């Protein structure tokens, strides 16, 4: 065949220290521990800069819920 699995181009190694102000946030993407060494959530800011975040922190779940 040609393989149809989706392989991530980047993974997170460390995450952010305090909740990010909502007015900055533009997008998110989620990193699966199935392929990445640790599962994380990658917020993308209005300046198109990407920030790693812990999926267990409360504020992450609120925001990614906010962005839908």
């Amino acid at each position: 065949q040609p393989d149809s699995v989706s392989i991530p181009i980047t993974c997170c190694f460390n995450v952010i220290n305090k909740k990010i102000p909502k007015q900055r946030l533009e997008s998110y993407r989620r990193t699966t521990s199935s392929h990445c060494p640790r599962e994380a959530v990658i917020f993308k800011t209005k300046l198109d800069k990407e920030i790693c975040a812990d999926p267990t922190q409360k504020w992450v779940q609120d925001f990614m819920k906010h962005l839908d």
């Binding site: 392989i7 991530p8 181009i9 997170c12 460390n14 952010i16 392929h35 920030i51 790693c52």
Partner: peptide, 17 residues
Amino acid sequence: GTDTCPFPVLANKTNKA
């Protein structure tokens, strides 16, 4: 933070990065 950017990876036949 200076260490919270996503980091490039590659994956082998197990698809683990």
